[PDB]
Amino acid sequence: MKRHYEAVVIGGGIIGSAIAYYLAKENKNTALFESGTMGGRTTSAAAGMLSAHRECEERDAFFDFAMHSQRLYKGLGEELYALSGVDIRQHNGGMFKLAFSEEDVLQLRQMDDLDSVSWYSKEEVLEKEPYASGDIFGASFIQDDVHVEPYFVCKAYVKAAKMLGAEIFEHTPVLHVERDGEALFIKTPSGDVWANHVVVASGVWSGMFFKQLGLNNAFLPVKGECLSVWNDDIPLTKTLYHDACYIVPRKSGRLVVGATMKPGDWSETPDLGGLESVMKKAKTMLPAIQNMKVDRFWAGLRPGTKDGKPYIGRHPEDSRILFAAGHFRNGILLAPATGALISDLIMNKEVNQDWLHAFRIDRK
Amino acid sequence: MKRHYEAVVIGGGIIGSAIAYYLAKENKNTALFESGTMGGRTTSAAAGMLSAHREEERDAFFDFAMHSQRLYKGLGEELYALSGVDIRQHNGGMFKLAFSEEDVLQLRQMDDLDSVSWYSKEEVLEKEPYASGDIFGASFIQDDVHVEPYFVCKAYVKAAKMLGAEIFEHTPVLHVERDGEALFIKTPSGDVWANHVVVASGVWSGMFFKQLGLNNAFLPVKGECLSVWNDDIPLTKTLYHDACYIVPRKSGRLVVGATMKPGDWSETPDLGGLESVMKKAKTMLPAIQNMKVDRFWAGLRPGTKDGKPYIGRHPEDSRILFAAGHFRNGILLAPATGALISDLIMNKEVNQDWLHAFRIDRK
Amino acid sequence: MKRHYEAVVIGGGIIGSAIAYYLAKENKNTALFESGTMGGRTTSAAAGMLSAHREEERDAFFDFAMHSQRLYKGLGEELYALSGVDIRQHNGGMFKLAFSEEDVLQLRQMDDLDSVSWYSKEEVLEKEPYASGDIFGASFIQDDVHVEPYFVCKAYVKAAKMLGAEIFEHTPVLHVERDGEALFIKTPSGDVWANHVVVASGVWSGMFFKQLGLNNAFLPVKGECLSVWNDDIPLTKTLYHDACYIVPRKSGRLVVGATMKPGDWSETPDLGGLESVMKKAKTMLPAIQNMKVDRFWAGLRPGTKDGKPYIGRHPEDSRILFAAGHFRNGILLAPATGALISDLIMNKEVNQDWLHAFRIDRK
Amino acid sequence: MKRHYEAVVIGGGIIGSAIAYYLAKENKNTALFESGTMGGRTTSAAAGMLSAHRECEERDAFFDFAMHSQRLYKGLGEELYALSGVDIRQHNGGMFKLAFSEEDVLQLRQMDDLDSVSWYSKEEVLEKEPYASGDIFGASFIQDDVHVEPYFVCKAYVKAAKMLGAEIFEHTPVLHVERDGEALFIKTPSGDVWANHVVVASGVWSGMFFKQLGLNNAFLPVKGECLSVWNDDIPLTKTLYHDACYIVPRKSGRLVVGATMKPGDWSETPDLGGLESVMKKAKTMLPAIQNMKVDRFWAGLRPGTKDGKPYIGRHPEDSRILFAAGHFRNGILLAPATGALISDLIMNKEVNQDWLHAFRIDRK
Ligand SMILES: Cc1cc2nc3c(=O)[nH]c(=O)nc-3n(C[C@H](O)[C@H](O)[C@H](O)COP(=O)(O)OP(=O)(O)OC[C@H]3O[C@@H](n4cnc5c(N)ncnc54)[C@H](O)[C@@H]3O)c2cc1C
Ligand SMILES: Cc1cc2nc3c(=O)[nH]c(=O)nc-3n(C[C@H](O)[C@H](O)[C@H](O)COP(=O)(O)OP(=O)(O)OC[C@H]3O[C@@H](n4cnc5c(N)ncnc54)[C@H](O)[C@@H]3O)c2cc1C
Ligand SMILES: Cc1cc2nc3c(=O)[nH]c(=O)nc-3n(C[C@H](O)[C@H](O)[C@H](O)COP(=O)(O)OP(=O)(O)OC[C@H]3O[C@@H](n4cnc5c(N)ncnc54)[C@H](O)[C@@H]3O)c2cc1C
Ligand SMILES: Cc1cc2nc3c(=O)[nH]c(=O)nc-3n(C[C@H](O)[C@H](O)[C@H](O)COP(=O)(O)OP(=O)(O)OC[C@H]3O[C@@H](n4cnc5c(N)ncnc54)[C@H](O)[C@@H]3O)c2cc1C
């Protein structure tokens, strides 16, 4: 460990990893501190859908940033693979947003006008995925709402960063950021470090730093419980989606299935009721999944915010301190765009101003 | 691995392990052959309740079960002395819950028994305050205890080993040959002579029956299970209802099961099966919703035409014995099964009702 | 989660769990906060030997260790009654082997002790025939037993819970604030007042010392371990030598360790470390070569400047107590640690030598 | 389960799976029986090196068949991915066959003349892999000795086969093959099945069937113990090889490390001495591996034969019965060629005759 770095990233989930990579690409002398292991928390629980077309939202700055981050994924695997040897495991099968009611059709067809989205009838869906529940009314088909394996996106980024010269310290919690001196300094159990810039990327645990730094931004965990099966019997290429729940086909023959929404619950292992409700929901979407062998079960804490958007930007009173946290259901999608934005801000480059405003810290 | 043994045991689940111990205890130069690892199959999937009181009619089967339940009395200490292995015995007891009047009536027929009592809703809820508030009371059975089946199995085999028995894991027996003055079996590592052969291969035993001119068939009844951590509530007694159960282990885990899928040979749980085990558990113990899941698993109960095991001699050849088909009660029945098979080999006198009830040629 | 507790315990390893039980036993309205899961850290990685006889000099530390070893006497039954959790106690005892004359000499200095005897090569090999044939004999210590540390931890916490203590997993404490008429701590889920705060955060305790104007430092000494299945040989006693050990569990597993890597904060084993644990084990028990590996793991021993824990009051503030830095002996010391912290809070009189040896301001 | 199939494959390792796929491609009504799960035995233990240039052998029929099977891998992933959704996880990093002595150099340079093999000096190796042991004398570099994940090759094949119409029955041991009737029939615990052709592909357990069928072909298990680490710190693209031991970099950042040779040992979990010796050997090849975190440990039974080559072909007295078993250290490499050969023989196509002879059952 050195005394000084030009930039310091606090937290080693996917968000922190992207930032570290993107700073090291700019040849900034960078260090990242992580409590446990890289990707060991909410990043590991994640399904890895790169879904910008959710929750079929309004067309705002949040959506453009999503579409943009989705674009940045196009050569990302190849880019990071060349430097890290780590494959992010990209699957380009696409997505069916299923409908089970007339009200479902109606709401989904409010997107048909986007060029990426077309509408399929009951018959047209089943032509492509015969095992989709027979009770469906049709589906929104999205070509670009693909997926990746979040753990490995995280490992590709951090490995790539190391190779570009970044310093990674696992098992090193940051206890405090200060704040007063000419330079910033951070305290660890292995002693202190000085920095020209500090990025807080500690997901749902980021409140500590906000408060240490005179800010009242709070985070609310929303726990999500998932499970996986082995699909040894059925063809399934497209991700099936309904009402925030999903069945995601992996390149291994596993299906990733989720998920519960449990606000205020900080626990990181599934309880019995959670898994039960996930299993019940999955069968309505793909009946054949009931005969599939269970593989793993797990949970993770989505980092919730008061308005549901992340905080990505400078401390309103100190340009040296940045935050990148609060990616609720979409931290995997947004990881590259978050990483690029943070890096550009630190380099004093000019950034999209709608994005700066949307994810600013001081939102009154 | 020798050329000859006095006795060969084929299969190292709880049953085969037991037989081998009783044989070794009698100074019979004994070998055991197991395809995989000791206890690695159905034995591993079992909850380990010693429940004889399962009513319906009190026949030969019932006596044998009660006799075996008695045999578990000093077993733990006995095997621990020889093996260093704890069978993890738990003396809490069992409540067989009632959810209807029909339930109450059927359970009250065991009342005459000394080991059984009826409890009312209010009396059950004093003892287990977290049992479902929908219960109409429960049959309490103080002596229907539980063990950890894997460790009973490991205890026995390690004991037999200390008594001289030779154990061969990763050694499938391919054929038993009956023709000559002595028996022999075939394995991939060579062929071994024997004076007695015991077939203890659980649901896979059919292979050998057929080889030896008998048409005895086994049907697997797959059972899926899960465990949760009970970190929050007191629960001393096993809860039971309609063949499902919640069993508190001395680790703080709860063992919960089980499905019943006949004709399925798969040994890992399906999603639908695990879903129904969770549904059922919640009806017995509502708080189970909020307990963190630990593990999920499955195994194959060895079913037979009439529900009863085959324990005894080949009707044409007293050198050959079978010990397979302990449906929902293989753990309970293992000590008595072991002692019976051993006694028969040794030509001792045995209960002739038990001999008749578990015989090979039935119709 | 309430606004106020009489006592708050920060950390749920074996130590914090113990403290919480003793506090709850005294009817103190008690809360415990743990970052992860109860016992999920160093406590989980510990072998669980109760070894006080570790010579060198017999000081205050030694008495305390012996006192704690006495406290384990009815503990298992005591905690089982309240919790339903078995601490998995094993009374086999320990051989501290000798491989040289230097070895013999150093070990023979404990001879005067009543709980200790010397055995010759031939006497050790009668008892444990598989111990290395290179031994020059061993110090036998009948009462240096072992437990399963995770379950001692779970036993205590579940007991405290049954006595009224409120437990909060997944709840890191971020700050202790000292300024006002009463203490408070800060958590992500809100802030809580307290009359006493106990810091029991193992190797991570430094955070709090600093916050509270004290410069006490912790150095982790990582220890890597493995387990094998002993399916083939008798082994009742623990084997010990030069801080490495082989411990037989009542499951049939052997627990083997350990490395000593100071300044390493990683909690999973490296390859080099596991290689050296295997090398060492084989020198003590050659047959271990042929035993199938089960698991490998690691944890961080909480080291201090002088090797001793800090157990006691903030020298400036009697509302604040510390219980951290039990280097190689946190499991052994947990009952006495729990009773000491509890007694201090309750203002009872305590051994003043022990109070002095484990005090916070040392130099 | 049906009464009759045109062909029946006994055993569901990689060999059996390839055969099932290749028969189903020819639209033969096919069934495969497996005791446990697909790929659950020796196929799962395997490293997945597709190495034809071992043990730097003589240039014979065995070698050509290997080179050929290696060629068949070129579009195999894409071929099977289109039908199964399962990625075989192909890595094209290549191989260094390291030398630690003058005798090592000498023996390795007996291959320089092959166009696929060039020689690197100590310096040239370290230029590419700085972490290779400094005690090396140089290395044979092989561009095409790539690798795959054997479990998934096996799953891709079996899934592809199902889609082509094949019937897969896991948890169904074959008890007996007979033999006498007009048609062949096999006995399972779920009852009997008739077949026009029977393929024995039961790896190291195949002796049973040879003997049931009047043949004395024996198999000797050679147990192999392996472990994996996480390489989070070091660049490593090339497989390192020395004296039958190996460090294989996976696309996940794991390194696969092996292996012991234990003849006559039928056990399928590592013992302590085995793993110790694997760890000791690995450090001499890549010193930095000693600081790497352990992940998994496992073992498998190589299916040995009297002469070290497999048996791939017809029963010398019955054209309806075939065997494909005894791929010692190279079943993953040879899986496609074995599958193609068996299928062609069953279809009475004309096959390479040197290959037929080399792997014939009756080798006196
Ligand atoms: C079941 C589930 C499914 C999901 N599926 C998707 C999906 O399909 N697509 C999608 O885009 N998103 C998904 N998400 C959301 C996604 O997981 C999150 O938005 C994202 O992982 C947040 O990334 P992060 O790096 O901010 O958080 P984390 O991965 O939680 O990382 C934060 C890191 O900071 C570390 N840290 C905390 N405190 C400190 C400290 N004091 N010092 C040092 N380090 C510290 C933590 O240890 C942690 O490793 C899902 C979430 C769940 C729960
Ligand atoms: C309280 C209680 C709870 C129970 N719960 C369950 C439950 O939840 N689920 C359930 O399924 N059952 C349950 N059971 C009962 C079940 O009967 C036992 O779990 C099981 O019967 C053990 O019987 P076994 O030793 O005959 O079979 P197994 O344990 O299956 O052992 C047979 C052994 O034979 C070996 N073998 C087979 N063929 C060969 C061969 N050719 N050569 C060499 N070896 C061979 C196999 O490898 C296997 O290890 C329960 C029983 C009780 C009493
Ligand atoms: C026979 C024997 C064998 C042993 N073997 C080993 C061994 O092999 N390896 C080894 O490493 N040690 C070993 N030990 C001894 C070791 O001292 C114990 O394993 C350990 O000390 C338990 O101590 P603890 O409860 O203080 O720490 P831990 O078990 O580490 O518990 C501290 C807890 O505090 C929590 N925490 C930390 N910070 C916060 C916060 N800010 N807010 C809330 N919670 C927090 C952590 O989550 C952690 O769970 C052994 C001891 C004995 C007696
Ligand atoms: C540590 C190790 C590393 C290796 N690395 C490599 C490598 O890098 N490259 C390479 O090319 N090779 C490697 N190998 C070799 C390779 O694993 C084998 O050559 C290959 O897997 C053999 O394939 P198989 O399908 O014949 O055998 P298996 O995968 O063993 O399959 C045989 C199947 O038949 C089934 N079966 C058995 N009996 C019956 C029955 N009676 N009824 C029904 N089914 C039955 C079994 O259950 C099993 O699933 C390695 C081996 C080991 C042990």
Q: How far apart are CA A183 and CA C180, in angstroms?
A: 32
Q: How far apart are CA C151 and CA C85, in angstroms?
A: 7
Does residue B20 have a cis peptide bond before it, meaning omega lies within 30 degrees of 0?
no
Sign of CA dihedral C250, C254, C260, C261: negative
3-state class (DSSP) for residue C33? strand
User: CB-based contacts of B350: which residues, under 8 Å, 6+ apart?
Assistant: B340, B343, B344
3-state class (DSSP) for residue A306? coil
3-state class (DSSP) for residue A31? strand
The residue among C283, C279, C240, C276 whose CA lies nearest residue C261 is C276
Q: Residue of the nearest CA to atom 45 in ligand 4?
A: D11
**Ligand 3 atom with minimal separation from the C33 CA:** 43
Nearest-CB residue to A253 (from D159, D236, D253): D159
Is C348 exposed, middle or buried, given 0-12, 13-18 or 19+ CB atoms closer than 10 A?
exposed
Q: How far apart are CA C342 and CA C156, in angstroms?
A: 14
The residue among C181, C179, C261, C166 whose CA lies nearest residue C219 is C261
String of DSSP letters for A144-213:
S--B--HHHHHHHHHHHHHHHT-EEESS----EEE-SSSSEEEEETTEEEEES-EEE--GGGTHHHHHHT
Q: Which residues in chain B have their CB less than 8 angstroms from residue D207's CB? A: 188
D289 close contact with C: CB closer than 8 A: yes
D172 with B265: CB under 8 angstroms?
yes
Q: Which residues in chain D have their CB less than 8 angstroms from residue A163's CB? A: 235
| Cross-strand bridge partners of residue C240 | C96, C245
D163 with D151: CB under 8 angstroms?
no
This structure's resolution (Å) is: 2.6
Asked whether residue B37 falls in the same domain as residue B170, the answer is yes
Q: Can you give the three-state secondary structure of chain B, one letter per residue?
A: CCCEEEEEEECCCHHHHHHHHHHHHCCCCEEEECCCCCCCCHHHHCCCECCCCCCCCCCHHHHHHHHHHHHCCCHHHHHHHHHCCCCCCECCCEEEECCCHHHHHHHHHHCCCCCEEEECHHHHHHHCCCCCCCCCCEEEECCCCECCHHHHHHHHHHHHHHCCCEEECCCCCCEEECCCCCEEEEECCEEEEEEEEEECCHHHCHHHHHHCCCCCCCEEEEEEEEEEECCCCCCCCEEEECCEEEEECCCCEEEEECCCEECCCCCCCEHHHHHHHHHHHHHHCHHHHHCEEEEEEEEEEEECCCCCCEEEEECCEEEEEEEECCCCCHHHHHHHHHHHHHHHHCCCCCCHHHHHHCCCCCC
3-state class (DSSP) for residue A216? coil
Q: What is the DSSP letter of A267?
A: -
Strand ranges, E, within C124-218? 138-141, 166-168, 175-177, 183-187, 190-199
The residue among D104, D116, D103 whose CA lies nearest residue D59 is D116
Sign of CA dihedral D104, D110, D115, D121: positive
Q: How far apart are CA B202 and CA B16, in angstroms?
A: 9
Asked whether residue A344 falls in the same domain as residue A261, the answer is no
The preferred substitution site among C38, C152, C204, C327 for testing ligand 3, maximizing ligand atoms within 8 Å of CB, is C204
The residue among A229, A235, A260, A233 whose CA lies nearest residue A247 is A229
Is D328 part of any known ligand binding site? yes
C290 close contact with D: CB closer than 8 A: yes
The residue among C298, C299, C320 whose CA lies nearest residue C310 is C320
Q: How far apart are CA A255 and CA A252, in angstroms?
A: 9
3-state class (DSSP) for residue C68? helix
Q: Do C293 and D269 touch (CB under 8 A)?
A: yes
**Six token digits for residue B327:** 């449906």
Residues 33-72 on B with a CB inside 8 Å of C are 38
Sign of CA dihedral C224, C228, C233, C235: positive
Q: Could you list the residue range(s) of the whole structural domain that residue A126 is in? A: 92-144+219-305
Asked whether residue C255 falls in the same domain as residue C361, the answer is no
Q: How far apart are CA A102 and CA B274, in angstroms?
A: 32
The residue among A11, A71, A18, A72 whose CA lies nearest residue A343 is A18
Q: How far apart are CA D363 and CA B214, in angstroms?
A: 39
Residue of D nearest to B264 (CA): D171
The residue among A104, A55, A58, A51 whose CA lies nearest residue A73 is A51
Strand A176-178 and strand A184-188: pairing? antiparallel
3-state class (DSSP) for residue C78? helix
Pocket flag, ligand 1, residue A331 (CB < 6 Å): yes
Phi-psi region of D191 (alpha: psi -120 to 50; beta: other; left: phi over 0): left
CA B52 to centroid of chain Cα atoms:
12
Q: From the CA atom positions of chain C, what is the Rg in Å?
A: 21
Q: Distance (Å) from the C-alpha of residue C23 to the closest C-alpha of chain D?
A: 40
Q: How far apart are CA A249 and CA C120, in angstroms?
A: 65
Asked whether residue B137 falls in the same domain as residue B236, the answer is yes
In this structure, which long-range contacts are made by residues C339-348, counting pairs with CB atoms below 8 Å and at least 24 apart in sequence?
Answer: C339/C22, C339/C71, C340/C311, C340/C312, C341/C19, C341/C22, C341/C23, C341/C198, C341/C311, C342/C19, C342/C22, C342/C23, C342/C25, C342/C26, C344/C312, C344/C313, C345/C7, C345/C23, C345/C28, C345/C196, C345/C198, C345/C321, C346/C26, C346/C28
D333 with D304: CB under 8 angstroms?
no
Q: Which ligand number lies closest to the CA of residue B300?
A: 2
Q: How far apart are CA C197 and CA C323, in angstroms?
A: 11
Q: How far apart are CA B13 and CA B9, in angstroms?
A: 11
DSSP run (H or E) holding A68: helix A61-72
The residue among D6, D7, D11, D18 whose CA lies nearest residue D174 is D11
Asked whether residue B175 falls in the same domain as residue B206, the answer is yes
Q: How far apart are CA A74 and CA A85, in angstroms?
A: 18
String of DSSP letters for C269-335:
-BHHHHHHHHHHHHHH-GGGGGSBEEEEEEEEEEE-TTS--EEEEETTEEEEEEEE--TTTHHHHHH
Q: What are phi and psi of B120, to 5 degrees?
A: -80, 165
**Six token digits for residue C343:** 């007694």
How many other C-beta atoms lie within 10 A of the C-beta of residue A85? 24
Q: How far apart are CA C238 and CA A49, in angstroms?
A: 52
Give the amino acid at D41: R
Residues 181-240 on D with a CB inside 8 Å of B are 187, 189-190, 205, 207-208, 211, 219
Q: How far apart are CA D170 and CA D16, in angstroms?
A: 12
| A34 CA distance to ligand 3 middle (Å) | 20
Final residue in a domain of this structure, among D290, D305, D320: D305
3-state class (DSSP) for residue C202? helix
3-state class (DSSP) for residue A229? strand
**Six token digits for residue C117:** 């005897």
The residue among A353, A342, A356, A311 whose CA lies nearest residue A216 is A311
B162 close contact with D: CB closer than 8 A: no
Q: How far apart are CA C307 and CA A290, in angstroms?
A: 57
C247 with C240: CB under 8 angstroms?
no
Give the end-to-end CA distance of chain C in Å, rounded to a whole number.
40
Query: Mutual orientation of helices D150-164 and D335-346 as an angle, nearest 10°?
Result: 30
The CA angle A91-A95-A98, to the nearest 5 degrees, is: 155
Query: Mutual orientation of helices A61-72 and A335-346 as an angle, nearest 10°?
Result: 100
Distances (CA, A) of B300 to B205, B247, B307, B337, C237: 13, 19, 14, 19, 38
Question: Experimental technique used?
Answer: X-ray
Distances (CA, A) of B136 to B96, B123, B143, B277, C165: 11, 10, 22, 22, 33
The residue among D223, D205, D329 whose CA lies nearest residue D268 is D223
Distances (CA, A) of C257 to C225, C253, C277: 5, 13, 6
> What is chain D's length?
364
Q: How far apart are CA C262 and CA B337, in angstroms?
A: 55
A19 with A9: CB under 8 angstroms?
yes
Q: How far apart are CA C29 and CA D170, in angstroms?
A: 57
B324 with B200: CB under 8 angstroms?
yes
**Six token digits for residue C310:** 């800090």
Q: Tokens 């315990």 appear where?
A: C9
Q: What are phi and psi of C218, to 5 degrees?
A: -120, 140
Q: What is the DSSP letter of C233?
A: S
A156 with A84: CB under 8 angstroms?
yes
Q: Do D267 and B188 touch (CB under 8 A)?
A: no
Q: How far apart are CA A240 and CA A248, in angstroms?
A: 7
Q: Do D236 and A38 touch (CB under 8 A)?
A: no
How many other C-beta atoms lie within 10 A of the C-beta of residue A135? 13
Q: How far apart are CA B84 and CA B81, in angstroms?
A: 6
Q: Tokens 């003058």 appear where?
A: D102
How many other C-beta atoms lie within 10 A of the C-beta of residue C57? 6
D169 with D1: CB under 8 angstroms?
yes
Give the end-to-end CA distance of chain B in Å, rounded to a whole number.
40
**Ligand 4 atom with minimal separation from the D324 CA:** 26
Q: Can you give the three-state secondary structure of chain D, one letter per residue?
A: CCCEECEEEECCCHHHHHHHHHHHHCCCCEEEECCCCCCCCHHHHCCCECCCCCCCCCCCHHHHHHHHHHHHCCCHHHHHHHHHCCCCCCECCCEEEEECCHHHHHHHHHHCCCCCEEEEEHHHHHHHCCCCCCCCCEEEEECCCCECCHHHHHHHHHHHHHHHCCEEECCCCCCEEECCCCCEEEEECCEEEEECCEEECCHHHCHHHHHHCCCCCCCEEEEEEEEEEECCCCCCCCEEEECCEEEEECCCCEEEEECCCEECCCCCCCEHHHHHHHHHHHHHHCHHHHHCEEEEEEEEEEEECCCCCCEEEEECCEEEEEEEECCCCCCCCCHHHHHHHHHHHHCCCCCCHHHHHHCCCCCC
Strand ranges, E, within chain C? 4-10, 30-33, 94-97, 116-119, 138-141, 166-168, 175-177, 183-187, 190-199, 219-229, 238-241, 244-248, 253-257, 261-262, 293-303, 310-314, 317-324
Q: How far apart are CA D28 and CA A294, in angstroms?
A: 32
Q: How far apart are CA D43 and CA D203, in angstroms?
A: 9
Q: How far apart are CA C155 and CA C160, in angstroms?
A: 9
Phi-psi region of A326 (alpha: psi -120 to 50; beta: other; left: phi over 0): left
C51 with C239: CB under 8 angstroms?
no
Q: How far apart are CA A191 and CA A1, in angstroms?
A: 9
The residue among D345, D353, D351 whose CA lies nearest residue D322 is D345
Asked whether residue A354 falls in the same domain as residue A231, the answer is no
A269 close contact with B: CB closer than 8 A: yes
CATH number at residue A68: 3.50.50.60
DSSP run (H or E) holding C115: none
Final residue in a domain of this structure, among D261, D278, D305: D305
Q: Can you give the three-state secondary structure of A88-115, one letter per residue?
A: CCCECCCEEEEECCHHHHHHHHHHCCCC
Q: How far apart are CA B185 and CA B194, in angstroms?
A: 8
CATH number at residue D118: 3.30.9.10
Q: Do B188 and D207 touch (CB under 8 A)?
A: yes
Q: Which residues in chain D have their CB less than 8 angstroms from residue A86's CB? A: 251-253
Q: Tokens 């780590």 appear where?
A: A86
Q: How far apart are CA C127 and CA D251, in angstroms?
A: 51
Give the amino acid at A104: D
Q: How far apart are CA D190 and CA D180, in angstroms?
A: 21
Asked whether residue D242 falls in the same domain as residue D127, the answer is yes
Asked whether residue C6 falls in the same domain as residue C40, the answer is yes
Q: Tokens 């090889």 appear where?
A: D241
Sign of CA dihedral B29, B34, B38, B42: negative
Tally B–D CB contacts below 8 A: 31
**Ligand 3 atom with minimal separation from the C208 CA:** 41
A335 with A18: CB under 8 angstroms?
yes
| Cross-strand bridge partners of residue C281 | none
Q: Which residues line ligand 4 (CB under 6 A)?
A: D 10-16, 33-36, 40-43, 45-49, 173-174, 201-203, 205, 224, 226, 258-259, 300, 302-303, 325, 327, 329-333
Instruction: Annotate B305-316 with b (16+ C-beta within 10 A) or e (fewer).
Output: eeebbbbbbbee
Strand D4-5 and strand D7-10: pairing? unpaired
| Cross-strand bridge partners of residue D186 | D177, D193
Give the amino acid at C308: K
Is A14 exposed, middle or buried, given 0-12, 13-18 or 19+ CB atoms closer than 10 A?
buried
Asked whether residue A139 falls in the same domain as residue A149, the answer is no
Does residue B169 have a cis peptide bond before it, meaning omega lies within 30 degrees of 0?
no
3-state class (DSSP) for residue C236? coil
Q: Distance (Å) from the C-alpha of residue C85 to the closest C-alpha of chain B?
A: 5
Give the amino acid at C349: E
Asked whether residue D272 falls in the same domain as residue D187, the answer is no
**Six token digits for residue B108:** 């009250």
Q: In the complex, which subunits touch C with 3 or more CB pairs below 8 angstroms?
A: A, B, D
Strand C190-199 and strand C4-10: pairing? parallel
Q: What is the DSSP letter of C244?
A: E
Sign of CA dihedral A283, A289, A294, A297: negative
DSSP run (H or E) holding C46: none
Give the end-to-end CA distance of chain D in Å, rounded to a whole number.
39
Give the end-to-end CA distance of chain A in Å, rounded to a whole number.
39
Q: Distance (Å) from the C-alpha of residue C142 to the closest C-alpha of chain B?
A: 17
Asked whether residue B168 falls in the same domain as residue B276, the answer is no
The preferred substitution site among C227, C301, C304 for testing ligand 3, maximizing ligand atoms within 8 Å of CB, is C301
**Domain count across chain C:** 2
A94 close contact with C: CB closer than 8 A: no
C177 close contact with A: CB closer than 8 A: no
Interface mutation target, options D294, D295, D296, D297, chain C, most CBs of C under 10 Å? D294
Distances (CA, A) of A113 to A53, A116, C133: 13, 9, 83
Asked whether residue D60 falls in the same domain as residue D200, the answer is yes
Residue of B nearest to D301 (CA): B170
